Amino acid sequence: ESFKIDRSVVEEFLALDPDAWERLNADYTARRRIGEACRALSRHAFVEEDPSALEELHDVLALIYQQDFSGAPVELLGCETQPVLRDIAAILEGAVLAAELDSISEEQISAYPRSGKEYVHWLKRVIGEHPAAGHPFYRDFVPTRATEGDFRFYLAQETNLDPKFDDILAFMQIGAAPDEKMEIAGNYWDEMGNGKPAEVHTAMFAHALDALDVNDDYIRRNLLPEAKASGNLASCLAISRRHYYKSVGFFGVTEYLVPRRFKLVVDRWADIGLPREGIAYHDAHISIDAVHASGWFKNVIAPAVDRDPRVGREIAVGALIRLNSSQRYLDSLLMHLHH
C-alpha cells in the first residue's frame, strides 16, 4: 500500500502459494501499487541516478529473469507469476533501455547502407570505432598484470552471460526467418556440444569457474552492478520477440569480439600456470566464435537487412547497447582490479 519495491519484496512474492498468487493477480489495486513502486524505483535509479537504487533495480530484474531462464522447481509449478512479474519487468526494462538509448544519437544509427553485405562492412567499422572493441582490460591489463585472483574476480563477472548463452540463442531464434533461424540454430547446436555432453559450452564454462573456486557465494558477494546490468540487458533483449533485431546486433558484437578477447585471456592463463583444463572453454571459443561471428554477419545480419533495411537501425542500436554496456562493465572491472 504505497510501498517500496526491492529484491526482498519480489522474493516474498515468489514465496507465495498458488492461491495467494491467484488472489494477488485478481487485485488490480495491489497491482497498480506494485507498478507505481516500480516507476518510483526507476526514477531513483535513472533520474536521480542513485547507485543503490540502480543496483536494487538490476537485482529485481535479475531475480525475475532467473524465473524466465531456470528450470521451475516443483514447489512453484502451480504459481501464476506472469501478470505481476511481467508488469515489473516491462516497467524496469523500459527504464533500463531508455537509459541506454540516451547514450545513442540518431547520427550513429541512420547512415548505414541499406543492403546486407554493405551493411556488414559499415557495422564492423562502427564497432571498431568504439573503445569497447579494444578495451585495455583485455589489451593491457590481462597480458601484463592479471593474477589468479584477478581472473577469479573477472570470471565472477562473466557469469552474467556465458552460463545462459544457449538459452539466449534459443529465445532469439523463435519465429526467425529461415536463413537467420538456420544460422542461430547451428550456433545453438554448437553451444550444445554438437550432441557431446563434454563439449557443451556451459559445462566447460563451469569448469573454468571450478578451477578458480568461483563459487556461488563468491559470485553473489563480488558481482559488480554493471555486470548485473550487462546480464539483464542480454536477458531483456533475448526474451521479447520485439527486441529480436536489437539482439541480433547485441549478440553479433558479442560473437565478433570474443576471439580477440579470449586469445588474450588464454595466453595469460597459460603464462601464469593456471589449470590447463580450466581454459578449455576459452581456448575453444577462439576458433569457434570466429566462425560464429562470420556466420552471424553473413547469415543473420546481412539477410535481415536485405529482407527489410529498416531493421539496420535496430541492429545498430543493439550493437551500441552491447558496446556501451560492455565499456561501463570493463571500466568498472578494471577500476576495481586496479584498487
Stretch that binds a copy of itself, among 27-35, 149-157, 214-222, 319-327 (CB under 8 A): 27-35
Comparison of 63 and 284: residue with beta carbon closer to Fe ion: 284
Q: Least distance from C-beta 288 to Fe ion, angstroms?
A: 6
Q: Specify the DSSP class assigned to residue 193.
A: G
Q: What is the CA radius of gyration of the chain?
A: 20
Decide if residue 25 touches a copy of itself (CB under 8 A).
yes
Out of 62, 170, 284, 291, the only residue in the binding site for a copy of itself (CB under 8 A) is 170
Nearer to a copy of itself, 152 or 246 (CB): 246
Query: ∠ at Cα 190 (185, 191), nearest 5°?
Result: 95
Q: Which does 289 bind (CB under 5 to 8 A by kind): Fe ion, a copy of itself, none?
A: Fe ion
- 78 touches a copy of itself by CB under 8 A: yes
Q: Does 89 bind a copy of itself (CB under 8 A)?
A: yes
Contacts with a copy of itself by CB under 8 A: the residue count is 59
Q: Which is nearer to a copy of itself, 55 or 100 (CB)?
A: 100
Considering only residues 11, 17, 49, 80, which one is a binding residue for a copy of itself as defined by CB under 8 A?
A: 80
Interface with Fe ion (CB under 5 A):
191, 201, 289, 292
First to last CA, the chain: 43
Among Fe ion, a copy of itself, none, partner that 170 touches (CB below 5 to 8 angstroms by kind): a copy of itself
Phi and psi at 135, nearest 5°, equal -75, 140
According to CB under 8 A, which one of 6, 43, 62, 69 is a site residue for a copy of itself?
69
C-alpha cell at 221: 558477494
Q: Residue from 51, 106, 197, 217 that binds a copy of itself (CB under 8 A)?
A: 197
Which of 236, 235, 238, 89 has its CA nearest to residue 176? 238
Q: Would the CA dihedral through 124, 261, 167, 24 be positive or negative?
A: negative
Closer to Fe ion at the Cβ: 84 or 257?
257
Q: Which three cell numbers stand for residue 100?
A: 541506454
Q: C-alpha angle 54/69/214, rounded to 5°? A: 70
Return the residue of 57, 60, 61, 79 that touches a copy of itself, per CB under 8 A: 79
Question: Residue 257 interacts with a copy of itself (CB under 8 A)?
Answer: no
Q: Please tell me the distance from the alpha carbon of residue 124 to that of residue 132, in angstroms, as a whole number.
A: 13
Please list the alpha-helical segments (H only) found in the chain.
Answer: 7-14, 18-26, 28-42, 51-69, 82-101, 116-129, 136, 142-145, 148-158, 165-172, 178-191, 201-211, 216-222, 225-239, 244-271, 280-296, 302-307, 311-338
Nearer to Fe ion among residue 13 and residue 205 (C-beta): 205
CA angle 5–9–12, rounded 5-degree value:
160
**Residue 104 contacts a copy of itself per CB under 8 A:** no
Which spans of this chain sit near a copy of itself (rule: CB under 8 A)?
22, 25-26, 28-29, 31-32, 35, 67-72, 74, 76-83, 86-87, 89-90, 94, 166-167, 170-171, 173-178, 181-182, 185-186, 188-189, 192, 195, 197, 200, 203, 240-245, 308, 310-311, 314
